[PDB]
RNA sequence: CGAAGGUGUGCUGUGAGGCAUGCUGGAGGUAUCAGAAGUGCGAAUGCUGACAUAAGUAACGAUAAAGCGGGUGAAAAGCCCGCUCGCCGGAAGACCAAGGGUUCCUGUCCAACGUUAAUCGGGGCAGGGUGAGUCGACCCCUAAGGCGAGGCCGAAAGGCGUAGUCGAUGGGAAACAGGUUAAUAUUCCUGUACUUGGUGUUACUGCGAAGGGGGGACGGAGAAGGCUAUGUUGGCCGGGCGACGGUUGUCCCGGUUUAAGCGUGUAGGCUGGUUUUCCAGGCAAAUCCGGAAAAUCAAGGCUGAGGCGUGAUGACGAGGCACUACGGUGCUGAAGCAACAAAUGCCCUGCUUCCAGGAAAAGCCUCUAAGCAUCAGGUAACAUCAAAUCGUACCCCAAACCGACACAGGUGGUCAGGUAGAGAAUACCAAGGCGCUUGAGAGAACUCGGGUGAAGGAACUAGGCAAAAUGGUGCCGUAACUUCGGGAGAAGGCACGCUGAUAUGUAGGUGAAGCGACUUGCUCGUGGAGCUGAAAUCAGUCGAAGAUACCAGCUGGCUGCAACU
RNA sequence: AGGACCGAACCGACUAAUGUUGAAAAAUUAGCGGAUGACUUGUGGCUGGGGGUGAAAGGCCAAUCAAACCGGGAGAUAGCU
RNA sequence: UAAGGUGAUAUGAACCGUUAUAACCGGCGAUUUCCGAAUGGGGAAACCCAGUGUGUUUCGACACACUAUCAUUAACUGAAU
């Protein structure tokens, strides 16, 4: 059983994009930014507890940060993990 | 309307200079051996 | 034509990587000199 | 209210020099007399930076090939769209690896970059995009190898190595069809699937080793057969009816697909089997293996392409039909097969031969040992739960890798359509992808790479260098010499096209039905429809020519030296 | 059957021209040799400098070889410019 | 010790404080990710694979500790014998 503190840590933010909107509207899937070390089970438990919805399955991927330049400064954005959370029949935010 | 960019990421062209010693053959031009 | 550098990450790490340096005392001195000089990158490891 | 420094002008001394004030500048500088010097440059193939010269000179990167009409914008040979025209097509098309690393997709911009312009961009700048129990990685296991507790050596430093431990380039469980975005797929979705464990339950049962025996698990070459991808032809269905003679017809043009899995068990290939008794073998020991007998059946079992059924009344599908931003979107959907010829793919790690005699372990399967024993465990069913983490964009024979370059160079594997063709040679095409990031003119010498030439014909040159020439198949024929294999395609000749007949298709191959049989079905004979289809021969016919292109041996002699590859 | 034969890929490299501030610090084009082997290619590993490795050429050892490269001795020394 | 602050480029937003507990500095603490002697085993440094306990569990799982080698010392048992 995962601790509540852990659940409160793993979810970072909802991902807003045209692919995310389409996924929610077609396949009833929510897209989240999650902690880079969060597992699928942790994400499932966190969603089920903090959003009071029922989760079918979670798909995850790691997004690699892009290398931008601030003038003459080579700088790299940090990596982050994205979760594709498929809800059974509930409705979320 | 969209905004003219002036960041000019590649305005630091710098540029250096280099060369390579080439190979040559002077044997027939030798006045000797 | 075929040039001298044929990249291969595995061989690069096995030949010049951090754990390759640490395995012998001469390699450990290579790290010592590079730390003393203040290199940002000690080895080819990345 | 004008310091140094510059930039000027005058004046003055033998000079190095000094002095004055015009301007710029904007904040410092210093008579004298002593003292110390990083104290004086034009050169060192000095050093570092700037700017010259040639000089608007060479070039602008494969001679695959373009021309219109638009759009856009401030502007277009190069961007885009359309229409024609060239080029690659066992590649210049894909798909990946390695390596790279966001180049991917989209919107803005035009400075710099792109060997030209650029409105464009792999440029800048931003935003999005990589979704997995089954694909990999990780992980189970091992090879070459590396390391290696102790150990044995070595002035130290260290070396070697046992138990071990890592280490793939190799063995170990499992998913496929349709649809999806501007960019993601066996990952999303939809349909159909499979694997490995756990945990219970219910039955039923001997379970149990870093230990034993099997397995994994294995060479090259050659010959089959049985097939299938893949084509081709008909049938069928959906249309058409001809910019100019014709053309409702052996007329034209398209479509004709369908998977894992689950059954069923065959062209093959291989071994006979079953009990009983026993043992100088397998750390010891075993019921596994190895050995020795006997009896009875030999007809028992394994393996294995393909096909077939289901999956699938599903999906897809030529086309329509609407809408519309003309991007594109939705909707509906006809036929959906057969014959012949089939690989370098499979059966096949098969089979046969050979000498050079062809990994390792684990998973796997069994046997027991110490032990455990009414348990534990095992086995089967049945639910239930878990299969994490990581990577998935894009390039990948190249403008994304290796070569400093958007460099005519290199770079492992996979796929392989048609017509000619022995062919993965080669010509032209298909799918696809391109026209090579400077162009427009003139049409000098000379250069480069080609074409053709009168009479001659090696006279050229150091020298036949280079060019030209030969070439293909069948058939006839072939010299010395020999190490009997060679030489030898020796040398030299001849025939090649089309049409018609034989026979509007013959020989051959493939083989429907039918007809029987049975040990009666993925059967076997016997028959034969159809289908494909040489090799000729004989007669005509045409051009100057029939291996009519591309493609493709020049030949013979005499001598040196090395046997040869 | 064959260190057989012809001939694609593949691996090489005899000749000619061109290129010589190249398209390239050895290529391109046209021919050429082999192409079931003493064959080629991938991925790892292994041998180190007076050393390796070599079907031999003083070949090769990261466009570097009668002795690799990097740093120290070291401001070696130079009756020479 | 204070009327000013919240590190900077890089400002802004959002705020905080005003004898005093804003900020800031001194002493003393806590927390302190992963690698790296790295030390639970490997490893192509910063990763993979753990075991053993002790709890918890909403039954899927979770949490926390420990586990390198060597020397010495003690205990235990202890080959050929």
Swiss-Prot record, chain A:
User: Which sequence ranges form a coiled-coil region, renumbered to this chain?
Assistant: none
Provide this UniProt record's keywords sorted from A to Z.
Answer: Ribonucleoprotein, Ribosomal protein, RNA-binding, rRNA-binding
Whether Lyase counts among this entry's keywords is no
Q: Tell me the outcome of changing residue 18 to Q.
A: Strongly reduces trigger factor binding
Q: Which domain of life is it from?
A: Bacteria
Asked if rRNA-binding is a keyword of the record, the answer is yes
Any idea what this protein is called? Large ribosomal subunit protein uL23
The species this protein was found in: Escherichia coli (strain K12)
Lineage of the organism: Bacteria, Pseudomonadati, Pseudomonadota, Gammaproteobacteria, Enterobacterales
Curated annotation (Swiss-Prot), chain B:
Its domain comment says: The rod domain contains six 100-residue motifs that appear to have a cross-beta conformation.
Any idea what this protein is called? Gelation factor
**Quaternary arrangement and interactors, per the entry?**
Homodimer.
Enumerate the transmembrane spans. Answer: none
Q: Which organism is it from?
A: Dictyostelium discoideum (Social amoeba)
What's its job? F-actin cross-linking protein.
Signal peptide position in this chain?
Answer: none
UniProtKB/Swiss-Prot annotation, chain C:
Q: Does the keyword Signal apply?
A: no
Q: Name one GO biological process term.
A: cytoplasmic translation
User: Which InterPro entries does the entry mention?
Assistant: Ribosomal_bL34, Ribosomal_bL34_CS
Q: Which GO terms describe its cellular component?
A: cytoplasm; cytosolic large ribosomal subunit
What Pfam families does the entry give?
Answer: Ribosomal_L34
Coiled-coil segments on the chain, per record:
none
State the UniProt keywords alphabetically.
Ribonucleoprotein, Ribosomal protein
Q: Which domain of life is it from?
A: Bacteria
Q: Which cysteines are joined by disulfide bonds?
A: none
What are the recorded GO MF terms, alphabetically?
A: structural constituent of ribosome
Q: Subunit structure, per the record?
A: Part of the 50S ribosomal subunit.
UniProt record similarity statement: Belongs to the bacterial ribosomal protein bL34 family.
Please report the name of this protein according to its UniProt entry: Large ribosomal subunit protein bL34
Q: Which organism is it from?
A: Escherichia coli (strain K12)
